[PDB]
Amino acid sequence: PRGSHMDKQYPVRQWAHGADLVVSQLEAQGVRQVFGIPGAKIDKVFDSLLDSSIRIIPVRHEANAAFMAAAVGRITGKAGVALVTSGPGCSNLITGMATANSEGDPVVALGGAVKRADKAKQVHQSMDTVAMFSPVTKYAIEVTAPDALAEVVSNAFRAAEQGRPGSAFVSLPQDVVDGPVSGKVLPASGAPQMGAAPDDAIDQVAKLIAQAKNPIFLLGLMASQPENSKALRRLLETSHIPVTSTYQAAGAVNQDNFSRFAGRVGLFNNQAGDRLLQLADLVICIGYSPVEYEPAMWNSGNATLVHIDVLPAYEERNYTPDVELVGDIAGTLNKLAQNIDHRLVLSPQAAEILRDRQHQRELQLNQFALHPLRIVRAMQDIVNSDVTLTVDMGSFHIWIARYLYSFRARQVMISNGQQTMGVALPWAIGAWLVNPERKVVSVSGDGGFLQSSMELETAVRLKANVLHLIWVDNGYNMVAIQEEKKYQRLSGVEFGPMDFKAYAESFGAKGFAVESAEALEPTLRAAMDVDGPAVVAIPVDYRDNPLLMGQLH
Amino acid sequence: VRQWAHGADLVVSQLEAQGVRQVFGIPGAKIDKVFDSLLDSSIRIIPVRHEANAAFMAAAVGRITGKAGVALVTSGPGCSNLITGMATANSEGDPVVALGGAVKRADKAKQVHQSMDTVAMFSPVTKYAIEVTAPDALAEVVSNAFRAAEQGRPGSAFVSLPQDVVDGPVSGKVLPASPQMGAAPDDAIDQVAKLIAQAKNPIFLLGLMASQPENSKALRRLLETSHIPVTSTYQAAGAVNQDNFSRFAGRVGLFNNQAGDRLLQLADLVICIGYSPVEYEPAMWNSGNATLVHIDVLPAYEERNYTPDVELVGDIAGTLNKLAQNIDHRLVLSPQAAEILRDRQHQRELLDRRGAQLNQFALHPLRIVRAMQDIVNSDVTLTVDMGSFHIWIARYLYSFRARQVMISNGQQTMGVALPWAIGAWLVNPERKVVSVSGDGGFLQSSMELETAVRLKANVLHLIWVDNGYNMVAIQEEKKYQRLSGVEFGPMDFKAYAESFGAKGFAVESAEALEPTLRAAMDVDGPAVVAIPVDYRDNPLLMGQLHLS
Amino acid sequence: VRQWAHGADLVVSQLEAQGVRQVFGIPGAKIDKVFDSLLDSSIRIIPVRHEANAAFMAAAVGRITGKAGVALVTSGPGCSNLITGMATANSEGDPVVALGGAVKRADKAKQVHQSMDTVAMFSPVTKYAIEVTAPDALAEVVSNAFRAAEQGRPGSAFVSLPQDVVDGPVSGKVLPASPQMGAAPDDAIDQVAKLIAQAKNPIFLLGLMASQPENSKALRRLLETSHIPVTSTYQAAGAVNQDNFSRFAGRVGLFNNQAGDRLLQLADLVICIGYSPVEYEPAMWNSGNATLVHIDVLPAYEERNYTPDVELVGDIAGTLNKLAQNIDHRLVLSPQAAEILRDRQHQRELLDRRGAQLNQFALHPLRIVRAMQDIVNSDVTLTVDMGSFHIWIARYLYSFRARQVMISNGQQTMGVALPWAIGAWLVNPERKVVSVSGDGGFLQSSMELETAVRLKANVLHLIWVDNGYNMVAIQEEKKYQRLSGVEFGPMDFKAYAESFGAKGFAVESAEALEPTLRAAMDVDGPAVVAIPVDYRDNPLLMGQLHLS
Ligand SMILES: Cc1ncc(C[n+]2c(/C(O)=C(\F)P(=O)(O)O)sc(CCOP(=O)(O)OP(=O)(O)O)c2C)c(N)n1
Ligand SMILES: Cc1ncc(C[n+]2c(/C(O)=C(\F)P(=O)(O)O)sc(CCOP(=O)(O)OP(=O)(O)O)c2C)c(N)n1
Ligand SMILES: Cc1ncc(C[n+]2c(/C(O)=C(\F)P(=O)(O)O)sc(CCOP(=O)(O)OP(=O)(O)O)c2C)c(N)n1
Ligand SMILES: [Mg+2]
Ligand SMILES: [Mg+2]
Ligand SMILES: [Mg+2]
Ligand SMILES: [Mg+2]
Ligand SMILES: [Mg+2]
Ligand SMILES: [Mg+2]
Ligand SMILES: [Mg+2]
Ligand SMILES: [Mg+2]
């Protein structure tokens, strides 16, 4: 019995400090570590964590605690935890929480607050944090009653992890966590046993599949979750309907495990996925929400639209599902699969599109600074199926995204709707903490790098096996391209150079700087063999970038 | 897709697609184009006398049909006058869509008069609140309001319509009405079926969604197959009654001596159907010693005292049907369970107070309750306002044999009865509707008597007249032994009702009660009856309530 | 500092310190302790029949006394029923303090029924909205509400009072009533005095604060010394009238042929007093070719069409007195200025329509306006609701010789007239108050007739009866040439009023209008007169309005 008052594993207790109950609750959630920075208003929670199995990981900027937490969330499926103090401690999380929420990464931030009695006073540091976090979280609440302490924390994890996952924020007044409380821990409740979409609705879609000549699956976030993996593969092998994924579902299906994969859609306007979508007469969306890929960019409207997710569709001018299958995805796809009478025979246009994609991929640039394509090829060599890849935001993101089919990484964190900079390095540290035995490669620009570079100290301190690569152009290039194209002049996109090798070494990490085109691969190969934090500076010639951005939406 | 001349045209066409039969409200310049467009549609315009009542009437339509009732008002005070109505609908789970006018998009930046931030005002009391700032999204936003209102656990939705958007041209199409989820997994149902078999004191706790029309047959199938006892929240008051099910333990929420609470505390297995903790605080009934099963259209809203061991989200009707098909045997009632229900029978026999015609003038509450039971049969809808009478009716709710009873009122809003009845009557005009309120609540919505007369609505409104706010006075009496701001003057309610062109009645004798009510029932149209009441016995009734 | 037994005691003591004479509202359990505590105070309890009207009555008290009127309601619907009232008070600059009950502090976290986020709901329509979460801050928060409401440009304030805070004990003291700023700098005043001397077409634009009682004498001193022409917003409608000042150019805001607008466009110097752009959109009058001077208690709320060349913030009364002392000479009117005012005189002579007794039945609007002017003298307060009659009265506002006129209504809220009058009467009971509304607006607040009868309030309410929402119908007629949702049924308003125990009247003849009104005036207590009106001539009047 979960709600029992006589459970030995989860006893009702007269807690000395609210903080103790909080930490006990976190343990029940299966939290392995917490990221953040302490302060007086929250120090008791940090203190209570000393008496628990949960590991404390001090970061150097709170924003990065949110980033690290998201990486943990995306991989484990259990919410990563950020822990900060009140005022600037909380407000420094807001971008991170927005980044986590938009990508569907489960994150729970516990933020300190002034005492309840000091909230009404015009005192400093009494931010309405709940109001500030609400627009960028699924869940935002302040614990005003000590009795609700365990309840609110449990609800935060539930909001973050269940449904379409997202970030959750909890404000903890100082007097509440320091003062005594009566209550018990709430055991963690898994995903609710939800039903498949209605049978009459499933057979209705099955009929459309048979009568369709260019069907295609559009995969969204929820399609990439583990509990849907087996059901998804079963449906694809039974139907052989082609597939294309959003970047939030980039890892849901690979070309190696499915022949009729049409790549990822979201950035480029000339992907096999897009052509098939425009060509489509029937599009079945799985685990997809319009935010992942604007329907205005791919939905011609000429195709019948089917919606399959754990939530109902949020209808809009370019997204009005003709059929709506709401319920457990795995159960829906399983039922749907049992009603596939025959495998799809591809249309000549459909088959040609997939043929063009493979052939193009099956394809010597000693120019200095390094050509982007040279750097991408070098990255592919060192990043294998035992290596996790994290990608920051910038022009390099587009280059890597363009050749994402040829990367053979275990997992790739690249999806970034908010287009937040500085995410790569913290993502890698978070990813490494989940799988320390494996290596993680992070890549950013010089701009994004310096926004989160302070966590290099955290990496050295953790002995994190992370290799960070920097595409150095000494400017904000992805912005400059747009300015050049629109105004034929630049504004505020140029800055000075740095000795990134010596910079990395001042942290106690291994530094590298590619001073020649021929030294690219040897340097990366060497930096990989380092058992610990390493940074590589890679000068890049972005002169060809305007050609690449023309392939975008 | 069509090139619409006015946004208002697209709005009305969308409403038509939603199956809207009528709209309630009051026009203004900022929204008059929508009113104008309704002239060219099958949709009926029903002018009210106060916007708050448009929301109330809309809720009544929503609760019955399951399709959102529609309120239509102008900007500024037109919108702000809806807020109490919208909050009442939302808390009761009544689907309502309010379309509210707004100043032109260009005048929102100027900060001119009548430019309320209505969306901010409506957000705390609605599922959905939005302003249409892009004409292209006009049809999308309206459809989304109906979906938000009608789907999941239903609620109220608000849409702000700038004048220039509804007046100006727009390109777009109507969105066909669409939600329908499948029953729970077989592996989940067999898991619950196993718990029922191994359980010795099972009990169903019925919440809002268990009372929906689409779940009635499936619910009856499960009760007849399992014979597990039942207790309901007041939001599910009409899901099961004492007369149609033998092991009914009454409704829980108000009284401290209900069979349902005793059975819940006794339970070793509690299956909640369509229930959310907000309907009845788990701190009052959940001992935690029982296995807790959750069946609803949404995942459970977990609380410190509500952590379900099993969680079934999906179609309720399909889930309950399947569950019934896997019940191996009917429940054999435990001695303690049977004793509790036996005690309830004796309790029901004691509350009836066999014989003892109460001769008191002013009329004794129980006398009025008995008189109401006589006139309200299975072909009559009953709507109940808020006050002391609410407690009396709620207590003898087991003995009412009404078609439908609208009484659930978490916000405890007064003045809801009459507008509810007008809304309820409009759904089934051929039938009679009885509304009952106090003198306080009556005058807060009495302006709709003219609307009832205009509609020839077959509504009989009863007034418990004490010339005061009694339900407050009693609480003051027990706490302070003195009254403050609970007394006001008398009125000639007969002439008052007749000034509207409705039939007026006044009970001037205890023996004249039933003849008057019967006479008022035989009126084919609006009729009002004033009933003087002696609330001196109320402290005896309030003692049966939860200290709270 | 004292150890209070109940927070409610401290609240009432604070109210006493604020000089509150009465409170309007309706009690409930969550707030009944404050009602109870008012029994032990000099403060009078005035139960209303709908909370919205408590806010309206409170505003009337505020506008007159300058001290905030007080509304007192319970939680949930008690609070949400105030929102329209509070928005109306705030937009008109009426000081109002609403004390609203709330659930216990412990039940706010549980998310239980009746736990509205009232502060979020009231914020968009108040100067000040706060919930008392710390009992120590109880007296501080109440005082701050009054200060927010009364100081600066006045407005409405809301305070949420959790049940346990007002019921539980508290330690604290009362805060004495405190704001008073000094006149503008001498160097600033001499600067303006210089501009007036060098100007050839100066004009005063009077806004809200110019109409406050404390500024009356100082304003009159400045006008008699300068003889600069004057035009007022409707919020300053009663600051100066045509009868008491020769160079009055009427009120600007509604009509497209006012002397004020012409003089403003002609102006080479515009001195705004107590004015904010919200009162009258600068896009309608500010050509920009004139030097602009700003005199108010706050810095100017600058806008694209309102960037004052000179800015005087401070005590208005002291500023205007000093300014007058530095006017070297009276204005010699320009030929264009004199022509405009001459045109206004001919206009006033044309609107009067010399002779021509209008014999029409139903009664012609101008006939009713003439009849109202006869009965409303300088000892009578006039309150005006919203509708077509509002336009008629507003147009002939120059010919009204009333003590005070409450007509300004930016939100254009209906049903304000009667509650305003009850509130106004309570400040000066020995005097008569006349309220006028339409049949639509009447029934939205008609429930307070019982309250008027209970108070023996000497109020005469007039109803322009057309059995419809006429002001909307006209706009529909011009735009669509057809009507929608603007028609409803008739009523016997005489018997309706009499059912309250008030005096009822019905004008059944054009010749019987004045005798009836005179008879109703002679009634010492509540009286209602129904006046059938022929609005067929209205399109002629609406043509005099700004296209808008
Ligand atoms: C926190 C922040 N600030 C600015 C930006 C702008 N930005 C990018 C972006 O998202 C856009 F420009 P858009 O509005 O078009 O979506 S990408 C980017 C990276 C440039 O610096 P870098 O890291 O050195 O990368 P490269 O020089 O190799 O291109 C910036 C600054 C943002 N995303 N986030
Ligand atoms: C809009 C509004 N205002 C006030 C009330 C307070 N009230 C009742 C109520 O809900 C409580 F007292 P609480 O939440 O604290 O339990 S019930 C009621 C009705 C009294 O007037 P009446 O209609 O004549 O009923 P009786 O005299 O026959 O008892 C009031 C005013 C509220 N609920 N809503
Ligand atoms: C709470 C409420 N509801 C509706 C209205 C609309 N209305 C008027 C109004 O303000 C406009 F039309 P707008 O802002 O667009 O100019 S005036 C009015 C009164 C009509 O009914 P009545 O009282 O009988 O007056 P007459 O028939 O004599 O003209 C209405 C309903 C509103 N202001 N407030
Ligand atoms: Mg949010
Ligand atoms: Mg760069
Ligand atoms: Mg229903
Ligand atoms: Mg909301
Ligand atoms: Mg009563
Ligand atoms: Mg004043
Ligand atoms: Mg505000
Ligand atoms: Mg009218």
Overview of this structure, please?
Chain A contains 22 helices and 21 strands. Chain A is of the alpha/beta class and 553 residues long. Chain A folds into three domains: 1-193, Thiamin diphosphate (ThDP)-binding fold, Pyr/PP domains (Rossmann fold); 194-364, Rossmann fold; 365-553, Rossmann fold (3-Layer(aba) Sandwich). In chain A, the strands form four sheets. Chain A has a six-stranded parallel sheet with strand order 3-2-4-5-7-6, sandwiched between helices. In chain A, strand 6 (139-142), helix 7 (149-161) and strand 7 (167-173) form a beta-alpha-beta unit. The longest helix of chain A has 15 residues, at 62-76. Chains in contact: A-B, A-C, B-C. The A-B interface holds A 1-6, 147-148, 150-151, 154-155, 158, 162-163, 183, 186-187, 189, 192-199, 201, 312, 314-317, 320-321, 324, 326-328, 331-332 and B 136-137, 139-140, 143-144, 147, 151, 172, 175, 178-185, 187-188, 286-292, 294, 299-300, 302-315, 318-319. The structure holds the ligand Cc1ncc(C[n+]2c(/C(O)=C(\F)P(=O)(O)O)sc(CCOP(=O)(O)OP(=O)(O)O)c2C)c(N)n1 (3 copies) and magnesium ion (8 copies). Chains B, C: GO terms for molecular function: acetolactate synthase activity; flavin adenine dinucleotide binding; magnesium ion binding; thiamine pyrophosphate binding.
